[PDB]
Design a protein around this ligand. Structure first.
Ligand code: CL
Ligand code: CL
Ligand code: NA
Ligand code: NA
Lengths: 155, 135, 161, 135
């Protein structure tokens, strides 16, 4: 039994970070793989383990998913998630959602409760709200760090 | 982008991928993250994959499924399949990024062609490994 | 290897009991006229990519087939169209999903492939991208046919009046 | 759903797929048609595929790409690959439908597991073949 996680790949410079900044990432990554290793150890499903690990990465403002989502060219947030169950080969996905705190949870909902693999935009949101998921403002995903990265990407 | 793959004590593989996309992206664009076979794939007979990086390339190369196909049909090992996709085929399409893969035999791979990939893995009942930079 | 095209106008429950020869011949006529256009383009040395684009634009135009004009109805009695195009040479692709205001989705899919760093766009944003590049806005009403409407009524119960 | 695949005189493959979905569908839903590797794929090394049928299943099975991978990596012929995907793997998942496939050698296959598939094909400078029912 085994888990891996990622919090995204790309242009990270050692020159751009203090050890104390890098340690927040290492601490966040260890705490989430730990949660998953314990779930696995306890006999939780691969599906509930990747769902919880990605919901935690979503909650963590360090990672570009849920809270700490990057900003679009329009200074908005637009979130996408997928889950796939290797046992049934069932899959579910949402794209272009702004009002769902945990997209991977809406993805799971679509996988379990939709004839379709994929829903988009307000329709995906309304599907999720029709099944008890709460509506949030896109403002909750916004962080100072990701905003400054937008201005730097512009500038 | 963020991602999780897992093999449970029952031999089940599962994958999940979540993102807010690319900084400064054009609104109503869709990268690999919500697309089965591009940014997320799982099959008990093969592998579970989460991907992160240039979405148009991950979609065009079907990166997640291509790991499964290279193994199932090409008889590449997980390590071979992850090398070929991330180190050869993504760059050939102008693509950069990485993925996390676990096969049904518990092999784990976390390839990336980027400067870093925030990453972690661990067997159950065992000490996790974490990484940011290359090696 | 010989230059060649194939086309489809969808798969499912087609029964010979359901159709006269003259009804089947509307379909055969439409399918021959589209493959023939594609075979002539190929014969002239036009690209596979331009050929599959023109063939799918013709299938969209033809109200017999469930794409563009003659699209089925949603539960909401409008039309929501999706298309993809892929170039086997460059491995470039373009796709739109959830579009209601573009006459020819496979043409918007071509636009995304050829005129963006993107593979896929969705909903109003896909349409706005297309309109910003000369593509005309249409009312979803243009896709609506009597045949597809009657199939919607056949597939449901009516709400109380 | 509608579709077109072609091989040109230069040896280039291409595929396109367009649809209005299923009658009475929930709005904001997406099937295989706009998804690279599910309802549309083209690769000069392998094949061009347009699919039509149960959207949910075509995505989970990555039908279009799976034809290409079976041929590219498994060394199956187009006919072998199309039989495998359309007559075995989609039905096993409850997938009904069909596809049109042309390989880089100009082989054509128009398989379906359904009652019919509105279809036509023809070599350049040659008389088209048309079909609705089985065979
Ligand atoms: Cl490191
Ligand atoms: Cl026939
Ligand atoms: Na986050
Ligand atoms: Na049409």
């Amino acid at each position: 039994a085994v888990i891996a996680i990622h919090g995204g790949a790309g242009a990270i410079s050692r020159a751009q970070m203090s050890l104390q900044q890098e340690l927040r990432y290492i601490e966040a990554l260890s705490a989430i793989v730990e949660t998953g290793q314990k779930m696995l150890e306890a006999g939780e499903s691969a599906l509930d383990v990747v769902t919880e690990a990605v919901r935690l990465l979503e909650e963590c403002p360090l990672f570009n998913a849920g809270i700490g989502a990057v900003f679009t060219r329009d200074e908005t947030h637009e979130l996408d998630a997928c889950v796939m169950d290797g046992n049934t080969l069932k899959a579910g996905a949402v794209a272009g959602v702004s009002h769902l705190r945990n997209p991977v949870l809406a993805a799971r909902l679509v996988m379990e409760q939709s004839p379709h693999v994929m829903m988009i935009g307000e329709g995906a949101e309304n599907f999720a709200f029709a099944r008890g998921m709460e509506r949030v403002s896109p403002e909750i995903f916004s962080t100072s760090l990701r905003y400054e990265q937008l201005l730097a990407a512009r500038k | 982008t963020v991602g999780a793959v897992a093999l449970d004590l029952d031999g089940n593989l599962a994958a999940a991928t979540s993102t807010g996309g690319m900084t400064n992206k054009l609104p109503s664009t869709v990268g690999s993250s919500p697309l089965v076979g591009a940014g997320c794939y799982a099959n008990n007979a093969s592998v579970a994959v989460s991907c992160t990086g240039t979405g148009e390339v991950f979609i065009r190369a079907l990166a997640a499924y291509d790991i499964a196909a290279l193994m199932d049909y090409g008889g590449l090992s997980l390590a071979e399949a992850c090398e070929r996709v991330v180190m050869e085929k993504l760059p050939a399409l102008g693509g950069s990024g990485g993925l996390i893969a676990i096969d049904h035999e518990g092999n784990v791979a976390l390839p990336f062609n980027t400067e870093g990939m925030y990453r972690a893995w661990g067997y159950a009942g065992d000490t996790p490994t974490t990484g940011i930079y290359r090696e």
